[PDB]
Design an enzyme around this catalytic site. Structure first.
Site, PDB file in Angstrom:
ATOM      1  N   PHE A 160      36.164  43.165  40.326  1.00 52.20           N
ATOM      2  CA  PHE A 160      34.998  42.275  40.239  1.00 52.20           C
ATOM      3  C   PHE A 160      33.723  42.826  39.578  1.00 52.20           C
ATOM      4  CE2 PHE A 160      37.469  40.509  43.953  1.00 52.20           C
ATOM      5  CZ  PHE A 160      37.767  39.231  43.467  1.00 52.20           C
ATOM      6  N   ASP A 162      43.765  40.996  38.726  1.00 55.52           N
ATOM      7  CA  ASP A 162      43.783  41.906  37.574  1.00 55.52           C
ATOM      8  C   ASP A 162      42.396  42.021  36.958  1.00 55.52           C
ATOM      9  OD1 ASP A 162      43.896  39.320  36.404  1.00 55.52           O
ATOM     10  OD2 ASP A 162      45.205  39.960  34.799  1.00 55.52           O
TER      11      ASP A 162
HETATM   12  O1  LIG Z   1      38.439  42.866  38.537  1.00 56.61           O
HETATM   13  C1  LIG Z   1      38.614  41.666  38.719  1.00 56.61           C
HETATM   14  C2  LIG Z   1      37.854  40.613  38.066  1.00 56.61           C
HETATM   15  C3  LIG Z   1      38.051  39.318  38.380  1.00 56.61           C
HETATM   16  N1  LIG Z   1      38.982  38.942  39.328  1.00 56.61           N
HETATM   17  C4  LIG Z   1      39.758  39.881  40.005  1.00 56.61           C
HETATM   18  O2  LIG Z   1      40.640  39.539  40.801  1.00 56.61           O
HETATM   19  N2  LIG Z   1      39.531  41.210  39.663  1.00 56.61           N
END
Ligand SMILES: O=c1cc[nH]c(=O)[nH]1
Length: 228
Positions: free
Chosen positions: A85, A72
């Protein structure tokens, strides 16, 4: 005017219509959307609505070469912007992202690393950074993980994969590997432990970026310049 209205609310790029429109008609989707709108009436939901589907804007389905799955969005204000990420240009890279950027430089010593953690360059290059849960309540990790985004996103991915054989999937961690199970005879499925430094194996040793490019080359697909 369902697609037209849905696209307008989220500013979705039209190139994704054939992959997403069929999901709109599913009754389960209506429950999802209503719940998301209910959450927005009762809490601070991230990222902002105009960014939830920002991943549809950087490249079309036909430009996709690699799919990287996440859980998420970041849950503190200013971090998330619709790409798994990635953080906006002047936000210091968080722990997991920091490890991802490390593994890229270990794989490609010649990569031109900017030092920032904004992955828009990758996105425009066909690297689809997709979380299975697209929203989160401010300050509470996994808070929206059971509202139904996973089945909607799951539907889009099945469609994309069936549309284009020979994609590379990078599945890091237990959640990603259980969420998405592409045909490994049709697609290149790369698995690793989660990028967080809390994982037992140091993510900086992951070779996925190199292995993905070798696979692409064998399919006569242009390899990716991982510099970012
Ligand atoms: O967007 C993101 C941020 C951190 N970790 C995840 O799995 N997704």
């Amino acid at each position: 005017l369902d697609w037209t209205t849905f696209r307008r609310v989220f500013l979705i790029d039209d190139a994704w219509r054939p992959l997403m429109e069929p999901e709109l008609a599913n009754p389960l989707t209506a429950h999802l959307l209503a719940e998301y709108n209910r959450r927005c009436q009762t809490e601070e939901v991230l990222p902002p609505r105009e960014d939830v589907f920002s991943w549809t804007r950087y490249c079309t389905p036909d430009e996709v070469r690699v799919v990287i799955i996440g859980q998420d969005p970041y849950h503190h204000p200013g971090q998330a912007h619709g790409l798994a990420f990635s953080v906006r240009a002047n936000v210091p890279p968080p722990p997991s992202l920091r490890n991802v950027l490390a593994a890229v430089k270990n794989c490609y010593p010649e990569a031109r690393m900017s030092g920032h953690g904004c992955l828009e360059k990758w996105a425009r290059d066909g690297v689809l950074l997709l979380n299975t849960t697209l929203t989160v309540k401010r300050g509470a990790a996994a808070s929206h993980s059971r509202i139904g985004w996973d089945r909607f996103v799951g539907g889009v991915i099945r469609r994309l994969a069936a549309r284009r054989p020979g994609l590379v999937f990078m599945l890091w961690g237990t959640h990603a590997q259980n969420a998405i199970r592409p045909d490994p005879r049709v697609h290149c499925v790369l698995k690793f432990s989660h990028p967080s430094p809390l994982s037992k194996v140091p993510f900086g040793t992951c070779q996925h970026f190199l292995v993905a490019n070798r696979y692409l080359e064998t399919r006569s697909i242009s390899p990716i310049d991982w510099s970012v």
